[PDB]
Paper text:
The current study employed a FBDD approach to identify a series of fragments capable of allosterically inhibiting caspase‐7 (C7). X‐ray crystallography confirmed that these compounds bind at the dimer interface of caspase‐7 more than 17 Å from the active site. The X‐ray crystal structure of caspase‐7 soaked with 1 was determined at a resolution of 2.8 Å. During soaking experiments with 1, electron density appeared in the known allosteric site at the dimer interface of C7 near K160. The carboxyl group in 1 forms an ionic interaction with the neighboring R167, and a hydrogen bond with T163. The binding of 1 occurred more than 5 Å away from C290, the residue utilized for the tethering of thiol‐containing fragments, further supporting the reversibility of the binding of these fragments. The appearance of density in the allosteric site occurred concurrently with the movement of the catalytic cysteine C186 into the P1 substrate‐binding pocket and the disappearance of the active‐site loop density for loops L1, L2, L3, L4, and L2′. Binding of fragment 1 appeared to move E216 towards Y229, displacing it and consequently the L2 loop. The partial occupancy of 0.71 for 1 results in alternate rotamer conformations of E216. Electron density was obtained for only one ligand in each dimer, near one monomer.
Author numbering:
A (entry chain A): 57 to 186, 212 to 225, 231 to 273, 286 to 303
B (entry chain B): 50 to 54, 57 to 187, 212 to 227, 231 to 273, 286 to 303
Write the structure that this text describes.
């Protein structure tokens, strides 16, 4: 009644887009450490129960396509959908290998009006960057926005540690709030959660 | 499943805190903005909801941009040492990133910046709540929460706002026993299935926020 329904066959798909290397025309540096971030995210979100797939050094057209196809799959037997973006990024925009893609554009494939099979289900985007309305049920968690080369992103280690420890007994906003705290206190900038959720989200039934 | 309750915000203070309501109904003609019929009724419900919670509520009306900037700056300079939190509620016309005074637009970011950690030493580690109905070493930005009436928004000349009616209902039933994100989530659901619009919460809180004990 007050939780998103989790009585589904699978938890859902998790697309991790991992961008380490960038083109000539972009002029942005190798993000040393994401292979430690993405690998940790893979275990976290896998241990949660997501069908995780990692995609490396994506173009904008590829990210767009990758997400468009994802949105076009059938999610009837899924509880939710997760996308994780590791890249560079200016305000309101993310980076492929071959330029810039707006984050609005990636998410738009999943709005209530374009992906009937995810309607009334959580759509979760995690971004770290160096009768029903169409915007309901999205959540964004940004990190801002700094990456360590040997340990990873302050944000990723906290999110992963907390998820391994409390992924099954804490609501999504609790988990994220404790991530906000650990990033501010232990490692100076803070993450940001944007929530259009309409129920509590637990990763268990 | 369900939960009960050093992960919470400290509530052991004399006062819960200030709650500043800005009720902009009437705009200079040169702005081309129209009277916001219904907003008096919103500001009333809000004043009662927040007083009932424990807030020292103050209501300002038909404010200019300089007035809005000044009363916020001065509030940021008061001594909040004995308050658990702070709240501001903006009712006005709005556009992307901006809010309307009676005479113009002013960036929402400039209004909230007065309360950053480096500029308001006495609300440090304390939640700073901003509720915006705009019909279209510590990180300095920590412990802010923004609850906007819509994503980057209607109202009823006779019934009031959607958001406010919902927010205020949920605050009376559950304001003293639900966590702030639990409350705001339920408001989201009600503005969604009670009536073509969805509110939007931006949280940088570092703890859970309960308005009690
Ligand atoms: C970017 C953002 O989320 C934001 C939305 C509205 C108003 C100001 C902002 S910026 C911000 C965010 C958190 C804490 C303090 C501030 C500030 O510096 O006033």
């Amino acid at each position: 009644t007050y939780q998103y329904n989790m009585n589904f066959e699978k938890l859902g798909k998790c697309i991790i887009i991992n961008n380490k290397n960038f083109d000539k025309v972009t002029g942005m540096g190798v993000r040393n450490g994401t292979d430690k971030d993405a690998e940790a995210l893979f275990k976290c979100f896998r241990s949660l129960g997501f069908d995780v797939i990692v995609y490396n050094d994506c173009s904008c057209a590829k990210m767009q396509d990758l997400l468009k196809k994802a949105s076009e799959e059938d999610h009837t037997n899924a509880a939710c959908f997760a996308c994780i973006l590791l890249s560079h990024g200016e305000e309101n925009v993310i980076y492929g290998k071959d330029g810039v893609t707006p984050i609005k554009d990636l998410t738009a494939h999943f709005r209530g009006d374009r992906c009937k099979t995810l309607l009334e289900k959580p759509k979760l985007f995690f971004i770290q960057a160096c009768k029903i309305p169409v915007e309901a049920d999205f959540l964004f968690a940004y990190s801002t926005s700094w990456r360590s080369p040997g340990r990873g992103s302050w944000f990723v280690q906290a999110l992963c540690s907390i998820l391994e420890e409390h992924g099954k007994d804490l609501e999504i906003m609790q988990i994220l709030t404790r991530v906000n705290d650990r990033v501010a206190r232990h490692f100076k900038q803070i993450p940001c959660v944007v929530s259009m959720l309409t129920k509590e989200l637990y990763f268990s039934q």
